[PDB]
Write a protein that binds this ligand. Structure first.
Ligand SMILES: *[C@@H]1O[C@H](CO)[C@@H](O)[C@H](O)[C@H]1NC(C)=O
Ligand SMILES: *[C@@H]1O[C@H](CO)[C@@H](O)[C@H](O)[C@H]1NC(C)=O
Ligand SMILES: *[C@@H]1O[C@H](CO)[C@@H](O)[C@H](O)[C@H]1NC(C)=O
Ligand SMILES: *[C@@H]1O[C@H](CO)[C@@H](O)[C@H](O)[C@H]1NC(C)=O
Ligand SMILES: *[C@@H]1O[C@H](CO)[C@@H](O)[C@H](O)[C@H]1NC(C)=O
Ligand SMILES: *[C@@H]1O[C@H](CO)[C@@H](O)[C@H](O)[C@H]1NC(C)=O
Ligand SMILES: *[C@@H]1O[C@H](CO)[C@@H](O)[C@H](O)[C@H]1NC(C)=O
Ligand SMILES: *[C@@H]1O[C@H](CO)[C@@H](O)[C@H](O)[C@H]1NC(C)=O
Ligand SMILES: C[As](C)(=O)[O-]
Ligand SMILES: [Ca+2]
Ligand SMILES: [Ca+2]
Ligand code: NA
Ligand code: NA
Lengths: 268, 266
């Protein structure tokens, strides 16, 4: 049981490569307000296709849980979980059964276990801005963006000591301690969103109109480059874009729609 | 236990990289004739540190088994296994309990199970040269060279349809079928020795003198480049150079000496 998860994690790392393409988005659902996030747990056991869904970016503490991806498309059946604190932004992630989010109007990260419904850890992000200071271009208190890739848990934010440029920190999923930190050269307020695939942070140019990935920072070498990978902004406003390594897709909240993007990675 | 093997094979592939260096050799044993091969199974279970030893490039069918590396260094304590046919060259490999070798005066490959002492599979290598035809630069009927890396079992040889240039084939360890073939443009006669690391074939400039790895063929892209990775030829003649994925080292038969090189990957 434990060796299977160790093996699948190794297989994912072996199939890693540079982002070369983003296919056309599929519309999974039309629901919610203009802003929000949705996601699945890439470390979910066999079965367990539960979709987690958080509407809005402010003073909403209710998380919806859908049974599966198909029940998320066609039905409105769900159970609601009340978080002890409201989240800020749409930067939450669900990882190995716990939801990680930014506490409302703070730089505090909270790990909340979804089965027993209890706070497991609370830790402030050192020098991270908050309260619409280093938001993504679309605003909405998106100062801190937590995400998961083939390597584990990550925090994307910005600090005053870095002139408001994006900072990447690898997090420990249990202690929430910063294991390593990279200073990028990209202003977080000028990015429309960001996502990490295989240790590489990809940053988009904006949130409306003709969007593209145009900056990549490689953490394995602390190098960066400007690129041009366009993707279709089907409903013209994107407020959430995150990669899921289990199904190699970007999850997006797009102007009151929930959409999915297949990605292409380089494989010799 | 099967997933432990499956997880370890994944971990090895994930730790792969480009060859960047070869350390100074260490002389493990002084024995044997001018030509031969020695190796360990990269897929031996824990507790199996057996060293396998084959003296000569012809007229010998007796494989020696030593208990461990330390018994190989300091003792002459070994068991003899008599193969059903003599081997050709020094390009044998031991892999997951079987020995793979080229049968004397033929291009046939034989998989021989060591514990049951049984031939498990026989198959002619397709279009491969034999009998001192497309040998390495040192000769010794080394027409066909079987090797193992992180990805499994390989066969390096030359064909006439490839104008005498090195051909690489990935083999199935059970059926001995050719899964995929790559045509290089490196003339096998000019190759001193060759070995595969992480799907890349490395070819040395000679079996003698100031030896150097100077050619790398990347099978993941069918491209090649010229490199410069010098290593010391302690005893002036090398009849065997094999990579072992488990210990990240090169095993060599250096003119009656058995030596080991550590490799550095990127
Ligand atoms: C919602 O759930 C109820 C009870 O669990 C079930 O009877 C009903 O069919 C479900 N509706 C949909 C649309 O899935
Ligand atoms: C996921 O959680 C289980 C127990 O709930 C733990 O044993 C396991 O190590 C965790 N996996 C990771 C990758 O942290
Ligand atoms: C990032 O920048 C801050 C302040 O500019 C500095 O204290 C820290 O050492 C930097 N870290 C790296 C990895 O460059
Ligand atoms: C991604 O590709 C898979 C298989 O090619 C397909 O089943 C799935 O529908 C695709 N999803 C998107 C959003 O393109
Ligand atoms: C071989 O092993 C025996 C005992 O098993 C020992 O007495 C003998 O000395 C060993 N051979 C050598 C060359 O040391
Ligand atoms: C090694 O041999 C065993 C037979 O005992 C087999 O089950 C296993 O799959 C083999 N391993 C490889 C990598 O071929
Ligand atoms: C290699 O060359 C032979 C003949 O020269 C040809 O039949 C074969 O298809 C070639 N293989 C590849 C992979 O190019
Ligand atoms: C190779 O490296 C290992 C560990 O660094 C060491 O124990 C061994 O002696 C080295 N062997 C050679 C031949 O340098
Ligand atoms: C999308 As806004 C101006 O409420 O941060
Ligand atoms: Ca994101
Ligand atoms: Ca060799
Ligand atoms: Na996120
Ligand atoms: Na060999």
């Amino acid at each position: 049981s434990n060796l299977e998860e160790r093996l699948r994690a190794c297989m994912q790392k072996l199939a890693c490569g540079k982002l070369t393409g983003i296919s056309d988005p599929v519309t999974v659902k039309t629901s919610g307000s203009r802003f929000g996030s949705w996601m699945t747990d890439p470390l979910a056991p066999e079965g367990d296709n539960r979709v987690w869904y958080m509407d809005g970016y402010h003073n909403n503490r209710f998380v919806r849980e859908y049974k599966s991806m198909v029940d998320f498309m066609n039905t409105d059946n769900f159970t609601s979980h009340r978080l002890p604190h409201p989240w800020s932004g749409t930067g939450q992630v669900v990882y190995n059964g716990s939801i990680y989010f930014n506490k409302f109007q703070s730089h505090i990260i909270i790990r909340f276990d979804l089965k027993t419904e209890t706070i497991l850890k609370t830790r402030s992000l050192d020098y991270a801005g908050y309260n619409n200071m280093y938001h993504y271009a679309w605003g909405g208190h998106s100062d801190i963006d937590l995400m998961v890739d083939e390597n584990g848990l990550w925090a994307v934010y910005a600090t005053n000591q870095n002139a408001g440029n994006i900072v990447i920190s690898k997090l420990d999923p249990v202690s929430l301690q910063i294991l390593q930190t990279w200073n990028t050269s990209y202003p977080k307020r000028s990015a429309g969103e960001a996502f990490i695939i295989c240790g590489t942070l990809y940053v988009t140019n904006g949130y409306s109109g003709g969007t593209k990935v145009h900056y990549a920072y490689q953490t394995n070498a602390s190098t960066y480059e400007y690129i041009d990978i366009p993707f279709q902004n089907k409903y013209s406003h994107i407020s959430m874009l995150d990669y899921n390594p289990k199904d190699r897709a970007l999850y997006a909240w797009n102007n009151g729609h929930q959409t999915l993007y297949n990605v292409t990675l380089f494989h010799a």
